Scaffold this active site. Structure first.
Site, PDB file in Angstrom:
ATOM      1  N   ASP A 236      35.985   7.229  38.813  1.00 20.41           N
ATOM      2  CA  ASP A 236      36.235   6.592  40.111  1.00 20.41           C
ATOM      3  C   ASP A 236      35.033   6.820  41.032  1.00 20.41           C
ATOM      4  O   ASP A 236      34.929   7.862  41.684  1.00 20.41           O
ATOM      5  CB  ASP A 236      37.473   7.181  40.756  1.00 20.41           C
ATOM      6  CG  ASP A 236      38.709   6.914  39.958  1.00 20.41           C
ATOM      7  OD1 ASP A 236      38.942   5.730  39.662  1.00 20.41           O
ATOM      8  OD2 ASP A 236      39.419   7.887  39.624  1.00 20.41           O
TER       9      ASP A 236
ATOM     10  N   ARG B  57      32.994  10.661  42.806  1.00 21.71           N
ATOM     11  CA  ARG B  57      33.172  11.940  42.092  1.00 21.71           C
ATOM     12  C   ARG B  57      31.870  12.723  41.943  1.00 21.71           C
ATOM     13  O   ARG B  57      31.891  13.953  41.980  1.00 21.71           O
ATOM     14  CB  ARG B  57      33.767  11.738  40.690  1.00 21.71           C
ATOM     15  CG  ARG B  57      35.046  10.987  40.606  1.00 21.71           C
ATOM     16  CD  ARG B  57      36.129  11.541  41.500  1.00 21.71           C
ATOM     17  NE  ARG B  57      37.374  10.832  41.243  1.00 21.71           N
ATOM     18  CZ  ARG B  57      38.427  10.784  42.056  1.00 21.71           C
ATOM     19  NH1 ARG B  57      38.446  11.450  43.213  1.00 21.71           N
ATOM     20  NH2 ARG B  57      39.495  10.076  41.691  1.00 21.71           N
TER      21      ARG B  57
ATOM     22  N   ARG C 120      38.381   2.443  51.909  1.00 20.93           N
ATOM     23  CA  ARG C 120      38.066   1.971  50.551  1.00 20.93           C
ATOM     24  C   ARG C 120      38.107   0.453  50.409  1.00 20.93           C
ATOM     25  O   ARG C 120      37.579  -0.095  49.419  1.00 20.93           O
ATOM     26  CB  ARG C 120      39.014   2.599  49.537  1.00 20.93           C
ATOM     27  CG  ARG C 120      38.892   4.116  49.401  1.00 20.93           C
ATOM     28  CD  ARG C 120      40.086   4.697  48.658  1.00 20.93           C
ATOM     29  NE  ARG C 120      40.130   4.300  47.249  1.00 20.93           N
ATOM     30  CZ  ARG C 120      41.189   4.461  46.462  1.00 20.93           C
ATOM     31  NH1 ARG C 120      42.320   4.951  46.952  1.00 20.93           N
ATOM     32  NH2 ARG C 120      41.132   4.109  45.184  1.00 20.93           N
TER      33      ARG C 120
ATOM     34  N   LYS D 162      40.923  -3.559  41.425  1.00 21.65           N
ATOM     35  CA  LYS D 162      42.142  -2.803  41.718  1.00 21.65           C
ATOM     36  C   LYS D 162      42.568  -2.960  43.193  1.00 21.65           C
ATOM     37  O   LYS D 162      41.733  -3.289  44.038  1.00 21.65           O
ATOM     38  CB  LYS D 162      41.945  -1.346  41.336  1.00 21.65           C
ATOM     39  CG  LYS D 162      40.933  -0.608  42.134  1.00 21.65           C
ATOM     40  CD  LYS D 162      40.427   0.661  41.380  1.00 21.65           C
ATOM     41  CE  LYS D 162      39.739   1.564  42.322  1.00 21.65           C
ATOM     42  NZ  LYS D 162      39.469   2.933  41.721  1.00 21.65           N
ATOM     43  N   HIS D 163      43.842  -2.767  43.534  1.00 18.45           N
ATOM     44  CA  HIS D 163      44.946  -2.419  42.621  1.00 18.45           C
ATOM     45  C   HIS D 163      45.903  -3.621  42.630  1.00 18.45           C
ATOM     46  O   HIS D 163      46.662  -3.819  43.581  1.00 18.45           O
ATOM     47  CB  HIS D 163      45.654  -1.165  43.103  1.00 18.45           C
ATOM     48  CG  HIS D 163      44.739  -0.003  43.296  1.00 18.45           C
ATOM     49  ND1 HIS D 163      44.003   0.172  44.450  1.00 18.45           N
ATOM     50  CD2 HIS D 163      44.399   1.017  42.470  1.00 18.45           C
ATOM     51  CE1 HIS D 163      43.269   1.266  44.332  1.00 18.45           C
ATOM     52  NE2 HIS D 163      43.493   1.798  43.144  1.00 18.45           N
TER      53      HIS D 163
ATOM     54  N   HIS E 103      59.376   8.002  50.070  1.00 23.59           N
ATOM     55  CA  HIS E 103      59.817   9.367  49.741  1.00 23.59           C
ATOM     56  C   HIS E 103      60.149   9.518  48.252  1.00 23.59           C
ATOM     57  O   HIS E 103      60.692  10.550  47.827  1.00 23.59           O
ATOM     58  CB  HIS E 103      60.975   9.824  50.637  1.00 23.59           C
ATOM     59  CG  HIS E 103      60.618   9.867  52.090  1.00 23.59           C
ATOM     60  ND1 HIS E 103      59.857  10.878  52.639  1.00 23.59           N
ATOM     61  CD2 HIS E 103      60.902   9.016  53.105  1.00 23.59           C
ATOM     62  CE1 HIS E 103      59.695  10.651  53.932  1.00 23.59           C
ATOM     63  NE2 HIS E 103      60.322   9.529  54.240  1.00 23.59           N
TER      64      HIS E 103
ATOM     65  N   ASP F  96      48.695   2.465  35.359  1.00 27.88           N
ATOM     66  CA  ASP F  96      48.709   3.557  36.328  1.00 27.88           C
ATOM     67  C   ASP F  96      48.537   4.889  35.611  1.00 27.88           C
ATOM     68  O   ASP F  96      48.715   4.983  34.402  1.00 27.88           O
ATOM     69  CB  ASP F  96      50.019   3.567  37.150  1.00 27.88           C
ATOM     70  CG  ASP F  96      51.281   3.676  36.280  1.00 27.88           C
ATOM     71  OD1 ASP F  96      51.444   2.833  35.370  1.00 27.88           O
ATOM     72  OD2 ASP F  96      52.114   4.596  36.527  1.00 27.88           O
TER      73      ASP F  96
HETATM   74  C1  LIG Z   1      45.963   3.639  44.542  1.00 26.15           C
HETATM   75  C2  LIG Z   1      44.931   4.543  43.934  1.00 26.15           C
HETATM   76  O1  LIG Z   1      44.094   5.113  44.620  1.00 26.15           O
HETATM   77  N1  LIG Z   1      44.978   4.683  42.608  1.00 26.15           N
HETATM   78  C3  LIG Z   1      44.005   5.556  41.940  1.00 26.15           C
HETATM   79  C4  LIG Z   1      44.675   6.584  41.083  1.00 26.15           C
HETATM   80  N2  LIG Z   1      45.701   7.141  41.551  1.00 26.15           N
HETATM   81  O2  LIG Z   1      46.289   8.067  40.764  1.00 26.15           O
HETATM   82  C5  LIG Z   1      47.395   8.809  41.318  1.00 26.15           C
HETATM   83  O3  LIG Z   1      47.809   8.429  42.407  1.00 26.15           O
HETATM   84  N3  LIG Z   1      47.867   9.820  40.584  1.00 26.15           N
HETATM   85  C6  LIG Z   1      48.926  10.685  40.903  1.00 26.15           C
HETATM   86  C7  LIG Z   1      49.625  10.603  42.108  1.00 26.15           C
HETATM   87  C8  LIG Z   1      50.664  11.486  42.364  1.00 26.15           C
HETATM   88  C9  LIG Z   1      51.002  12.462  41.436  1.00 26.15           C
HETATM   89  C10 LIG Z   1      50.311  12.556  40.229  1.00 26.15           C
HETATM   90  C11 LIG Z   1      49.271  11.662  39.971  1.00 26.15           C
HETATM   91  O4  LIG Z   1      44.197   7.004  39.790  1.00 26.15           O
HETATM   92  C12 LIG Z   1      43.190   6.205  39.139  1.00 26.15           C
HETATM   93  C13 LIG Z   1      42.364   7.170  38.308  1.00 26.15           C
HETATM   94  O5  LIG Z   1      41.947   8.204  38.835  1.00 26.15           O
HETATM   95  C14 LIG Z   1      42.270   5.480  40.124  1.00 26.15           C
HETATM   96  O6  LIG Z   1      41.345   4.639  39.410  1.00 26.15           O
HETATM   97  C15 LIG Z   1      43.059   4.651  41.141  1.00 26.15           C
HETATM   98  O7  LIG Z   1      42.191   4.004  42.088  1.00 26.15           O
END
Ligand SMILES: CC(=O)N[C@H]1/C(=N/OC(=O)Nc2ccccc2)O[C@H](CO)[C@@H](O)[C@@H]1O
EC number: 3.2.1.52
Length: 333
Positions: free
Chosen positions: A62, A70, A130, A160-161, A173, A242
């Site tokens: 990402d 990152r 973003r 995305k998304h 929630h 996802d």
């Molecule tokens: C909406 C969003 O930001 N999704 C990102 C994304 N979001 O992941 C989660 O929200 N993971 C998560 C959320 C809550 C609990 C556990 C995992 O993961 C992908 C890989 O890292 C990204 O490419 C996506 O952009």
């Protein structure tokens, strides 16, 4: 290449990592900040990943800019995607941003960044700056330029998304946000346009329910991923799931069942992040399937960071991106 994207714990591969990466169900490694210490260490890690796999494997990250970058130290900083449209020369700057981001990744032996964000608006806290803009035309104008930059250096692109995460403004929630709008036509228009242009190699769907359209989250919905994305919109590329480790087992079952369901729903590939035990369960228990069309996502060019830095295009892009950050960053004011 198999369907599964997984990750590793740190800066170098463990024995378990090297064993897992050979497994035919693996298709890619998604890298995070915790896998990045410095430029040379990253190059070494990516070499090791490719050697361990013993067949082509995707390496992704990402790397959007701004809040989502990152690899920062020893890289050029890329601005929030929001910033391009704030400048008068935003189209030129967006192309520079896409080019620079992609080029530096290619120079460190990464195949792709999961980008661009085509979501519309800034009101969803997780999205925010973003997004390239808050209306259809601003998002298309600037994302298209960013895409052109990525493609110029041979990097595969990921929208995305899908069908749009920009307006998730309430908290359900629950694990899955809802977007209760009766119409999301504007949000989807952006995706439709980029699909028709033929400029997206891949798509990541939103883990969001749009109840006026369909009862399942887009990322797990045949309505969204097949009827709309494939049949109506004519998307021919790779669909990523996802992050499945995010989904609760109480409804969706364990990681093997969740992987199966994502694939049946219309995903080509599945992501299991930050949950090694789940990734191994899926490798151990999911029937073997190949995703040969994923090889389309392998980077098309090869060059070193030394070579890149000798290009005028790099010298200008890097200077211009730092200046653009300085123009609008509250931190730099
Ligand atoms: C909406 C969003 O930001 N999704 C990102 C994304 N979001 O992941 C989660 O929200 N993971 C998560 C959320 C809550 C609990 C556990 C995992 O993961 C992908 C890989 O890292 C990204 O490419 C996506 O952009």
């Amino acid at each position: 290449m198999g369907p599964l994207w997984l990750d590793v714990a740190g800066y170098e591969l463990s024995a378990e990592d090297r064993e897992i990466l050979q497994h035919p169900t693996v298709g890619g490694v998604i890298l995070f900040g915790r896998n990045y210490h410095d430029n040379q260490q990253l190059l070494a890690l990516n070499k090791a990943i490719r050697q361990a796999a013993k067949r082509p494997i995707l390496i992704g990250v990402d790397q959007e800019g701004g809040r989502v970058q990152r690899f920062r130290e020893g890289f050029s900083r890329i601005p929030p995607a929001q910033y391009y449209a704030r400048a008068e020369n935003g189209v030129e700057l967006a192309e520079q941003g896409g080019w620079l981001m992609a080029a530096e990744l290619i120079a460190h032996d990464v195949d792709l960044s999961f980008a661009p964000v085509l979501d519309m608006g800034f009101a969803c806290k997780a999205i925010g700056n973003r997004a390239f803009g808050e209306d259809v035309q601003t998002v298309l104008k600037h994302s298209s330029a960013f895409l052109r930059g990525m493609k110029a250096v041979g990097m595969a692109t990921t929208g995305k998304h899908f069908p749009g995460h920009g307006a998730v403004i309430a908290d359900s929630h629950l694990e899955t946000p809802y977007d209760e709008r009766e119409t999301i036509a504007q949000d989807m228009a952006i995706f439709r346009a980029q699909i028709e242009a033929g400029v997206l190699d891949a798509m990541m769907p939103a883990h969001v329910v749009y109840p006026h359209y369909d009862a399942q989250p887009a990322s797990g919905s045949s309505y969204w991923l097949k009827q709309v994305l494939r049949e109506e919109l004519g998307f021919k590329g790779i669909v990523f799931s996802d992050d499945l480790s995010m989904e609760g087992a109480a409804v969706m079952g364990g990681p093997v069942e969740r992987s199966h369901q994502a694939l049946v729903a219309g995903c080509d590939m599945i992501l299991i992040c930050n949950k090694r035990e789940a990734a191994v369960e899926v490798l151990d228990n999911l029937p073997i399937m190949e995703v040969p069309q994923a090889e389309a996502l392998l980077k098309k060019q090869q060059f070193s960071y030394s070579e890149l830095k000798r290009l005028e295009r790099w010298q200008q892009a890097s200077a211009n991106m730092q200046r653009l950050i300085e123009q609008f960053s509250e931190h730099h004011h």
